[PDB]
């Protein structure tokens, strides 16, 4: 056993969404071993927060039309799925949005909770055309992982059935795109030994370094069973 462990070298954060992470030195073949196994956990298993429920006033269903609003309610729900939200303390927060007058309703119009950060405040949700028009809604953000559709969520719970509650497809996973590469390491005299560049392209909330840390933790927790129980 010539155990040679890699170490986190450099995190080239080009943007808050897109960041490269270089990794060296890796012994031959471990570059692709961790590369893919991590990519899989980073795609599907990464916990995140996502808009689960919405409840707009003057709205009985998502297919209706609201006066003084360019977008149909479905297109508003779409914008709320891609609303970047980070809940710090609790798993479930129900934010309130009341806004009026002529203006594109941005994410900053939502009343921020003590422990809730709206990561992109300039994110568009709805367009108010008429000055007389006012919009009011209650946006529930819950935490989960992966992607939970509204068609899978309308066939499980349904204990309380309040008429006026629109469910939304949850985009819980924060990682949008991920693709690991391999480059020259140029260490001491290892030569063969190289590195592993993990390029991540995420939303706002989950931080590149933090996310890779969590993904390696999930893989190590699955490996407990193969180390401990034989």
């Amino acid at each position: 056993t010539e155990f040679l462990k890699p170490r986190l070298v450099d995190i080239e954060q080009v943007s808050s969404t897109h960041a490269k992470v270089t990794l060296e030195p890796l012994e031959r073949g471990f570059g692709h071993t961790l590369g893919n196994a991590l990519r899989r956990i980073l795609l599907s298993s990464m916990p995140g927060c996502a808009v689960t429920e919405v409840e707009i006033d003057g709205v009985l269903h998502e297919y209706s039309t609201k006066e003084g609003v360019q977008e149909d309610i479905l297109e508003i729900l779409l914008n709320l799925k891609g609303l970047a939200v980070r809940v710090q303390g609790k798993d479930e927060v129900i934010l309130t949005l009341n806004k009026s007058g002529i203006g594109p309703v941005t994410a900053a119009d939502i009343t921020h909770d003590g422990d809730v950060e709206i990561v992109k405040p300039q994110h568009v949700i709805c367009h108010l055309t008429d000055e007389n028009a006012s919009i009011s809604m209650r946006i529930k953000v819950q935490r989960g992982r992966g992607y939970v559709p509204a068609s899978t969520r309308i066939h499980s719970e349904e204990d309380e059935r309040p008429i006026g509650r629109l469910l939304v497809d949850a985009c819980y996973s924060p990682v949008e795109r991920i693709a690991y590469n391999v480059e020259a390491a140029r260490v001491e005299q290892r030569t063969d030994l190289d590195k592993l560049v993990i390029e991540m392209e995420t939303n706002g909330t989950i931080d590149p370094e933090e996310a890779i840390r969590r993904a390696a933790t999930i893989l190590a927790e699955q490996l407990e069973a193969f180390v401990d129980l034989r």
Binding site: H32, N36, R39, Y180
Partner: protein, 50 residues
């Protein structure tokens, strides 16, 4: 004209790219034709047909 347009986007003449298996991570043995085809959902849906 299509190959000339592919060079404007810094894409291959061939219109075939080296893809990699999502499951494993290793490469497929050859370049695979990839691109954007406009597809259509027909009315023959299985919820009605079953």
């Amino acid at each position: 004209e299509i190959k000339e347009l592919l060079k404007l986007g810094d894409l291959p003449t061939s219109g075939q790219i080296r893809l990699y298996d999502g499951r494993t991570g290793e490469q497929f043995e050859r370049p695979v034709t990839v691109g954007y085809m406009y597809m259509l959902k027909l009315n023959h849906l299985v919820d009605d047909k079953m």
